[PDB]
Every structure is written in C-alpha cells, then in structure tokens.
Subunit: 158 residues, 2 copies
C-alpha cells in the first residue's frame, strides 16, 4: 500500500505556498514570451490536514487526477458566483478524472474524504509567480461575503 | 471495481486511428499560431486487445495517469535508439504518474498487465492531424532493423 509519505518521498515533493505538496515534473523547452514557457506541469498532493487555499491564476490550469481520494474544487467567478467540480473516478457522480479551472477565478480544493490525494496540474503559459496571487481570508470575506463558510475552509486569517 | 466499459461509456470514448480509445477533454481557447492552439487534452483508454501503435507527433505530449494498468512508452530516437519509461502508480519500481514523450520521436505504448488503462494526454501546440503520423510495419522494419521485436507489437503491415 502507499501512504502520502511514500509519494512525497519518492516524488520529492516540496511544501507549496498555497497548500499541500508539489514538484515540477516537466517544463517545455519551447517559449511563449521570452519570459514564460509554453507549458508547465507538476504533481500536486494533499494530505489529510492539507488544502489548496484560495488563489487566482493568470492562465488556465488543467487538472489530471492521479490517485488517492477524490477532490472537490471550489471556484468563485469574478462576479461572486461559486461553482464546484469534482475530480476523480466515481463517474456515477459528477466526478471526472480531468478538469480545467479557467483563468481569472479564485479557486481552492479539498479531499472529499480523509487520507491522501495526488493530482497532476498543467498551466499553459508556464507558471511563474507573477501569474499567481494567493488571498487573505479577510480580503475574501470583504468581497464575496455570501461565501463565509467556504472561504473559511480554504483560507487562513491575515 | 470499474472497468474499461464504464470509462469508454461515461467519457464517451471513440476509437483512435492509432489504436485505443479517446475523447478530447478540453482545448485551449487561446491561440498559439493562427493555425494551431495553445494546447489540448484528451482521455485515452487501453484494453487487453489494444496497444498504441508507433506514430510521430510534431509537438511534445505530456502523459498523466488516472487509473488502471501501468503502461510502457516505447520510443525510438530519430537516430534509431530505443528508450522506455514506466507510467503508473507503483513508486517501488521505477513507475511515475507523469511522463513527457519528446516531439519528433516515433513512439507507442502497451499495458504491462491485462486489464484497462485510462490516461491523460496533453500535446502543447494544439494537436491538429497535420502534427500526426502513423507508421506501417514495413517502413519500421526498413529503418531501425535492430528493433524488430517491439516493432512487431506496436505496428502492423501493409
């Protein structure tokens, strides 16, 4: 059997600023802007006490379910609209093994069950941090006050 | 205990000219060239009777692993050099959930055990069929004669 500890170890996953663990698997050798590359891809893991806190990306991000527990991805449009997609293998429910979280929204994510969860993420315009913006729980309760409950599950204070 | 039948059905997978089953998941709404797109992803399944026959792409292709049976990417460099990689979820052996099959190279894949295999494939500059190229067993035994053994599995005559 394989725990979360086995994946972080063998895959060499670093802690992530947004939450969970990660490690750039491959990066294009082609360029988009003489700044960013054509695509970037990582492994992304979530342990029980983990979550990927609300943050926004300047580009589209492809999600590939790799293993473990299924996830619920929470998204808030730039209009306050909250939607959700589930990633995984239980096709009976709205679970899909892939999903595209559209650039411009503020999304988070959590496992639908205790345990561990490993995914694969791919942002086309090569991910840089000037294309990343994490958010304060305050900054998120001010805008979108209607989503107190959820904005507390995917955001820490200050 | 899902099986290949559930996947092909729920994900609506139709035969691929190169073999196996597939269905585009998402394409990138952003353009790369006036011709192709920034990116594209498709699902791709493999059953005990199917293998992905040697073919060549114009762009790189990322491979994600959703579930099923570890595969094996057989690649042949333009200089006639056969390399292999183990896609899958067993970290004990050299299995890795993601793999990058470099463009300009002729490759194919088979499963490792009988069963099924759902896989994620992301080719960067939008996969147009101009960037594709399937090969006959003929040409493959001509060029690269020292690899007949595997050419007789991931290829077919006439």
């Amino acid at each position: 059997m394989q725990n979360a500890d086995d994946f972080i170890k063998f895959l060499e996953l670093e802690q992530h600023v947004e939450g969970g663990f990660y490690r750039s698997s491959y990066r294009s050798e082609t360029a988009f802007d003489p700044s960013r590359q054509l695509w970037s891809s990582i492994y992304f893991l979530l342990r029980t006490g983990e979550v990927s806190h609300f943050h926004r990306l300047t580009a589209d991000e492809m999600w590939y379910f790799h293993a473990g527990q299924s996830l619920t991805i929470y998204m808030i449009s730039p209009e306050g609209e909250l939607t959700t997609a589930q990633l995984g293998l239980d096709l009976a429910a709205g679970e899909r093994p892939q999903f595209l979280v559209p650039k411009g929204c503020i999304f988070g994510s959590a496992m639908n069950q205790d345990g561990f969860s490993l995914v694969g993420c791919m942002v086309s315009p090569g991910f840089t941090f000037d294309d990343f913006e994490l958010f304060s729980q305050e900054a998120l309760l001010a805008m979108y006050p209607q989503h107190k409950a959820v904005v507390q599950k995917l955001s820490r204070p200050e």
